[PDB]
Amino acid sequence: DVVMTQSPLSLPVTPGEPASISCRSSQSLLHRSGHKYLHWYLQRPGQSPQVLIYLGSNRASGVPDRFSGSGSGTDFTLKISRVEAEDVGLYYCMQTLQTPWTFGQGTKVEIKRTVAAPSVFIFPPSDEQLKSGTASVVCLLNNFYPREAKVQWKVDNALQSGNSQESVTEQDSKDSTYSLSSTLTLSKADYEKHKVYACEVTHQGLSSPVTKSFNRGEC
Amino acid sequence: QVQLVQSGAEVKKPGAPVKVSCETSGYRFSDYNVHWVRQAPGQGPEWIGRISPNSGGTKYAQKFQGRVTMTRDMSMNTAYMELSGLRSDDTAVYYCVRGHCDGTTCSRAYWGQGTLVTVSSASTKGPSVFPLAPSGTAALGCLVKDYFPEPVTVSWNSGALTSGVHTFPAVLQSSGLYSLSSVVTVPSSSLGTQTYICNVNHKPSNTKVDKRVEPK
């Protein structure tokens, strides 16, 4: 079997700067052909992975000449001569010298932009949801960087722990920010028992945490 | 043009089998191996096996020996992958792949679009869609709650509104059902004048909803 060793796992790069991803094979991937059986892909959730480079150094049609591949035998590189914001994503090398086909761990290219503080919004449960008997309170952190953020929920100043779920978008392909949604779940009965609903946000761009809140049922 | 198109998303209970098809056109089917690869959440890709069309010969990775059967029908230029005894960690996107070489020359691979197989005790259910109402710049959105399985698609104003939209990854609630939000930021000056509608489609339950979101 062939082990494929990819590095680095995370590649933060300033837009405009070059980038290089390494891939090492446990045995040479050359001449049963002419070719080196090493290929590079970009993961694309929802469809086929995009072939970038195939057979070592052949750039697929449509791929910008900013991308190139090289290597011989056991050590390969995928190079981006000038990284653009749209290049964010997850990149894999893989070998087909032998079956089973085997894959590198993957490299997440991240764009390093200036710090951007989140814009915070809070949404009460809709009257429609309340009529159905449930209550979801949603806190939105919009267009921030870097990704690290803490969201703390408070209900009449009681710290909520374990009652919320959050998820985060992939890095935006144009402005390189993230957005995050946190949902606090309560029974309608419990929602009606309380007044002050508060989302407290900690982020590098905020000197001190920001709290967005609302009082239940007040226009 | 070389084309490989797979059958649609599948949802199965643990213990059941699944059979995925890979229909091809635009090339000599007998000249290339067809490989199958999957990728599970939080995991790297995995090669499952391959079939050689001209001989029918199969080769499977050790992990799938005795679990997987690959077949093909030459008259239909189609390959199949059947995976039996499904478990929760068989939840993955499955791909068919035309091999690189035709026994004389080599070039790029061609991939199918993928087939999501969800393995779960849960039963298919449509989402409820709730507005996330606004009231300079305002945020609004839709909460798409308690559906199974993935995925749902969300657009805004039938695709006319894309700038500033964020549709978040679904979270799997403790009740085995998914929930997600989709939001957009808009000018407050437009609230009550410009209509904002989130178009939600959950094909597994054949649920399509156009929800207007209005300020409170």
Author numbering:
A (entry chain L): 1 to 27, 27A, 27B, 27C, 27D, 27E, 28 to 214
B (entry chain H): 1 to 52, 52A, 53 to 82, 82A, 82B, 82C, 83 to 100, 100A, ...
Original authors' sentences:
Using a high-throughput, single-cell, screening methodology, we were able to recover a panel of 52 tau antibodies from the memory B cell compartment of healthy individuals between the ages of 18 and 66. Two antibodies, CBTAU-7.1 and CBTAU-22.1, were studied in more detail as representatives for antibodies with activity in the in vitro tau aggregate seeding assay binding to distinct regions of tau. Binding of both CBTAU-7.1 and CBTAU-22.1 was notably affected by ionic strength, which suggests that binding is stabilized by ionic interactions with involvement of phospho groups in both cases.
Binding of CBTAU-22.1 was found to be dependent on phosphorylation of S422 and, as seen for CBTAU-7.1, affinity for phosphorylated peptide was modest (32.7 µM). In Fab CBTAU-22.1, the CDR loop residues also fit the electron density very well, except for the more flexible CDR L1 residues 27d, 27e, 28 and 29. A disulfide bond is formed in CDR H3 between Cys97 and Cys100b. Similar to CBTAU-7.1, three basic residues, Arg50 and Lys58 from the heavy chain, and Arg27e from the light chain, are present in the antibody combining site, which display very strong positive electrostatic potential. Interestingly, two sulfates from the crystallization buffer can be modeled into electron density in the highly basic combining site. One sulfate SO4-1 hydrogen bonds with His35 and the main-chain amides from His96 and Cys97 of heavy chain, with Arg27e in close proximity. Another sulfate SO4-2 forms a salt-bridge with Arg50 of heavy chain and hydrogen bonds with Thr94 of the light chain, with Lys58 of the heavy chain nearby. In contrast, CBTAU-22.1 immunostaining on AD brain tissue is confined to more dense or aggregated tau structures and shows comparable detection as obtained with the Gallyas staining of neurofibrillary changes.
